[PDB]
Every structure is written in structure tokens, then in C-alpha cells.
């Protein structure tokens, strides 16, 4: 199983050309690479024998395997050899990997499934023997990008005139949500950086993103080298000062030609788009379940007319998914999100647009956590979809952050409390307190990620006990950064929280001793139980002063 049509890593187009190159037998790049580069970076014998053999094939096709090789490290295949470092002489199977995904992603080499394997295309070949700088191979590149979905999604989100960051365009990029396409708040991302040290300030201006963000400041650079899009950056007023965004876009003219006529609205055929099962989902535990529902939600669309999602659910039925009609509406926003055109009028869906042929490889049982997501989605009528993504985020070590941004969003824009997320070594992941309640009380959260159910470490306890005694003694030396300031002075009654997917074990014991050293209620609560609290908020059903009688020193539950 691989994924592609998605890239996050930057790389020259000088070395995409390269990669390119290779798959085409009379050209320069090709010879050097088989005749001169792996031979010599190249040590281990047997496999240097099995490559330049393999690059001396007439018709050449490469495997997986062949062209990405493994790592730990030595030169273990093509890519690895045909591409210098940016000081080995080659580079890394991840690097590598990278521009596999790119060259494959603008069609300028097919996969061939089953075989694992990959070739030339049409237009690689054009691309490999155009001259460089040329206006025509320039033409080839514009060609490429606009049979690129996420590109044009990307000129979609501009085409007002907009400027954009990339959590402006990632927050509507792919699949949004949900593992693999998250997207940071810019408003949350900004107060980061304005409270932030000048030291710090340009690793969180561009390091700090969520996937989808990676993705748009990638696909956008793209566009920008290729005259569609402008990069400058964005400038913002964040009194804690001022601060700015430089991976941020703006349309072109020459944009929104391509633009137009990928629209339909010119009197030329759009591109066709290229769509490929791999890119339907990618870090996703469920990714082989997931690809194919989507997968054939599109095809329904695409040999079908103007239908309702009542018979795209039953089309769907026809085939054995048994799915929820709004599972299947988040599967439609995400293929919208993604490049694809379909128009919803009242309850009409109709796909608009051109599609190329693309195959659902072995043509499964829903696991778990997916029939949970498709429960809630089904049963939650107020709460944004997207925040159903945090049952399966909150399992990744990997995405604390997200979950961080997230949840305290999710308090203060559902739950309607007041406050902010902090985050940091010093800071608690967010404070939030409320107004006019009959008590008004202030809440000191911590969130954390973690795959199996979080029986609170003495060591996360610790942590938190900090906090609540901080702003208890509020002295600036024990902390300058005197966060604490966050709340209005008239509140005095507060509690602390922990937040994750699930816990088990004895968590109870640590809010006992938390409760007794610092005389605050205190309490866990499961992801789960966060949404369906904040759906009974909506709802009705419940208030703000009944969730501050659920501080009672254990697990909340609505």
C-alpha cells in the first residue's frame, strides 16, 4: 500500500527534471546516472550490478524497491544516486521518496499497480528533452500542475484576490480534520508568536504547521515559481506588537486563466485531473477502508447525473458499504477540498468537471475507531464534523500540538468559553473561565496525545501542580511570563482538567493527591465526552455551571 498526490518537503524543479530524466533512455541524465553515478556511489557490488542492468533494459520500468531503496546509511538505488546532497554524493531514502511522489504527482511518470512499479508518461518525455528555461518546457510544467487537484484548489481559494497563509488555504485543503490533513489556527498560531522570544519567532513563523498547512506553503511555492501565485508575506497587529507570515499567497493574471479554463468557463477543454486511490487518505489507520469508499463515492458521481445523497448512499449500499449519510457528506467535502468540482444545489449533488480513469487496486472491515467516528457523526447534530478527527488524532504521540489548538478552540467556540491556549514548558495548554455564570470559574487545562489510554504519569500530575500553585502565589520571579494574567482579577474558585483520548489505570489516585496539596477540584476527560458535552451546549441540554459541579476529583461523564 503507498500514497501518493501529496508532498512535504521542498526540492529543486531542477531536480525534479533529473528524476525525471531518468525514466527516459536517450536522454544525457540517464546514461550519466547508470554509467557513472552508481557504479561509483554505489559500493555494495550485487546491487550495483542489478541496477545499471536494470537501467539498461529497452523498455525501462523501475520498481519501488529499485528507485527508493532503504535506509537507516549507503546508496541504495536510483533516485538515491541521481540526486546529490545539499553538503554522501546522494540522498536518503526519504528525500528520495519525496521526489518519486512529485514526479509521479504532476503525471510526469505512471504507477502500474500490482507491479509496484512506475514509467515514463507523455508528457515526461516532453519534459525530459525540453530545453531548460525554454517557454516551452515552462508550458509542459503549467500543463502538469493544472491535471494537479490540490493545485487547483489551491487558485480556487485565491481567486477573489485574496492573501492567504497556509492555515488559511490548509484549513481547506484535503481532508480537513482528520490525520495527515490538520491545519493550525492562524488566529491561535499568531499569539504564539507574538508572546514568542525574537530567538523563536522564526522557527513558529515557519516551522510550526499542520499537515495541510505543509501541503499549501508546498503546492503554493509550486505555483509560485511557475508565475500562477505570489508569495509575500502577510502582516498582522497582535498586541500581547506586531507580526507577519511570509509563506503567504496571492493570485496572479496568468493564474486565473488557468483557473478559468480549468472551470470550463473558456473555449478550451479543461485539463483532465488526475486522481489516484493513493491520495484519497494517507495517515490514516484506516487508510485501505477509507480510499475506497471515497473512491467509489467519486465514480457514482462521475457516471451519474444530478443525485440525492440518499441514492449515493444506496448506490453505495449496492456495492457492500454500508455507510451514514453523513459520512458520506464529509467524504464529498473532502473530495471538494481537494481540486474536484462538484456543485450542491439544495439537495442535488452533480459533479462538474473532467476525470481520468483511475483504478481501486484488490477489488475489508471498518475498524473500530472509523464505526466510532461514524457514530458521532451520525448522532451529533451541532458539533463540527471535523472535531469527530480528534478521537483518532489523540492517539498519535506525534500530534500533541494540533491537539492542543484544537481542543481549547473547541472549549471557547462550542462550550462558549472565555481565554485562550498557551502551551510551552512554562505555560499550561490553555485557561479558560466564563462570565455571567452564577459562579463565574476559571479552568487550567492539559492535553495529551497518546496511543492506549493515559493512566496520568506522576510526572504529567506533576506538571500540572505547577500551575495551579502558580496561580495561586502568582509571583513573576518563580515565573516572568506571568501567565496567570489571562483570567480577570474577580475570579478565585478554579479547577484543573486533563484531557485524552481515553484513560485507564489509577488516574484517580493522582487527582486525589492534586486535591488535597492544592485544595482544588480537579478532574479527566476523554475526548469522547468533550464532543458530547459540547453537542448538549449546542443542544441545550447543558450548562456551563452543570460542568463545574463535574470537577469532583474524577473521570467526567455527560
Given amino acids: 500500500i503507498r500514497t501518493f498526490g501529496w508532498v512535504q518537503n521542498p526540492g529543486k524543479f531542477e531536480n525534479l527534471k533529473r528524476v525525471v530524466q ?5 536522454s544525457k541524465v540517464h546514461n550519466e546516472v547508470k554509467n557513472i553515478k552508481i557504479p561509483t556511489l554505489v559500493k555494495e557490488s550485487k546491487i550495483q550490478k542489478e541496477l545499471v ?14 528507485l527508493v531503496g532503504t535506509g537507516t546509511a549507503p546508496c541504495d538505488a536510483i533516485i538515491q544516486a541521481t540526486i546529490a546532497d545539499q553538503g554522501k554524493g546522494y540522498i536518503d531514502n526519504w528525500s528520495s521518496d519525496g521526489f518519486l511522489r512529485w514526479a509521479h504527482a504532476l503525471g510526469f511518470i505512471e504507477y502500474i499497480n500490482k507491479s509496484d512499479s512506475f514509467v515514463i508518461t507523455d508528457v515526461g518525455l516532453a519534459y525530459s528533452k525540453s530545453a531548460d528555461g525554454s517557454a516551452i518546457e515552462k508550458e509542459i510544467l503549467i500543463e502538469a500542475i493544472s491535471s494537479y487537484p490540490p493545485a487547483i484548489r489551491i487558485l480556487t481559494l485565491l481567486e477573489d484576490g485574496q492573501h492567504l497563509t497556509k492555515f488559511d488555504l490548509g484549513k481547506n485543503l484535503g481532508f480537513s480534520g482528520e490525520s495527515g490533513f490538520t491545519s493550525l489556527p492562524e488566529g491561535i498560531l499568531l499569539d504564539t508568536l507574538a508572546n514568542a522570544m525574537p530567538k523563536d519567532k522564526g522557527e513558529i513563523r515557519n516551522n510550526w504547521e499542520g499537515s495541510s498547512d505543509k501541503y499549501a506553503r508546498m503546492i503554493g511555492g509550486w505555483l509560485d515559481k511557475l508565475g500562477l501565485v505570489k508569495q ?13 507570515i511570509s509563506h503567504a499567497f496571492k493570485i496572479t493574471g496568468e493564474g486565473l486563466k488557468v483557473l478559468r479554463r480549468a472551470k470550463g468557463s ?3 477543454t479543461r485539463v483532465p485531473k488526475r486522481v489516484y486511490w493513493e491520495m484519497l487518505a494517507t495517515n490514516l489507520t484506516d487508510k485501505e477502508y477509507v480510499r475506497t469508499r471515497r473512491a467509489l463515492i467519486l465514480e457514482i458521481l462521475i457516471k451519474a447525473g444530478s443525485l440525492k445523497i440518499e441514492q449515493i448512499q444506496d448506490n453505495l449500499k449496492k456495492l457492500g458499504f454500508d455507510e451514514v449519510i453523513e459520512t458520506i457528506e464529509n467524504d464529498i467535502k473532502g473530495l471538494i477540498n481537494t481540486g474536484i468540482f ?21 477489488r475489508l472491515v471498518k475498524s473500530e475507531l472509523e464505526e466510532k467516528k461514524s457514530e458521532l457523526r451520525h448522532k451529533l447534530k451541532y458539533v463540527p464534523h471535523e472535531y469527530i478527527e480528534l478521537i483518532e488524532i489523540a492517539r498519535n504521540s506525534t500530534q500533541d500540538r494540533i491537539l ?14 472565555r481565554g485562550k491556549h498557551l502551551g510551552g514548558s512554562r505555560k499550561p495548554d490553555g485557561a479558560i473561565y466564563t462570565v455571567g455564570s452564577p459562579i463565574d470559574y476559571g479552568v487550567i487545562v492539559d492535553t495529551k496525545a497518546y496511543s492506549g489510554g493515559y493512566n496520568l504519569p506522576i510526572g504529567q500530575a506533576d506538571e500540572m501542580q505547577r500551575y495551579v500553585e502558580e496561580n495561586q502565589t502568582r509571583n513573576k520571579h518563580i515565573n516572568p511570563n506571568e501567565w496567570w494574567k489571562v483570567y480577570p482579577s474577580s475570579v478565585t474558585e478554579f479547577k484543573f482538567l486533563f484531557v485524552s483520548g481515553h484513560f485507564k489505570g489509577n488516574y484517580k489516585a493522582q487527582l486525589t493527591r492534586l486535591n488535597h496539596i492544592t485544595n482544588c477540584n480537579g478532574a479527566v476527560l476523554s475526548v469522547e465526552e468533550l464532543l458530547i458535552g459540547g453537542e448538549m451546549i449546542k443542544a441545550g441540554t447543558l450548562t456551563l455551571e452543570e460542568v463545574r459541579r463535574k470537577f469532583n476529583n474524577g473521570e467526567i461523564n455527560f
Avoid at 531518468?22 to 536517450?26: E, G, P
Avoid at 542492468?53 to 529499485?66: G, P
Avoid at 509575500?232 to 507577519?244: L, M, R
Avoid at 462538484?342 to 484488490?362: A, C, M, S, W
Fill in 404 to 417: 492542543e489548538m484544537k481542543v481549547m478552540e473547541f472549549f471557547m467556540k462550542v462550550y462558549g468559553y
Fill in 232 to 244: 509575500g508575506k502577510k502582516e498582522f497587529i497582535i498586541p500581547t506588537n506586531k507580526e507577519f
Fill in 53 to 66: 542492468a536494470i537501467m539498461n533494459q529497452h523498455d525501462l520500468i523501475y520498481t519501488y524497491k529499485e
Fill in 266 to 268: 473558456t473555449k478550451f
Fill in 22 to 26: 531518468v525514466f527516459d533512455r536517450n
Fill in 342 to 362: 462538484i456543485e450542491i444545489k439544495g439537495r442535488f449533488y452533480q459533479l462538474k468537471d473532467h476525470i481520468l480513469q483511475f483504478v481501486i487496486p484488490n
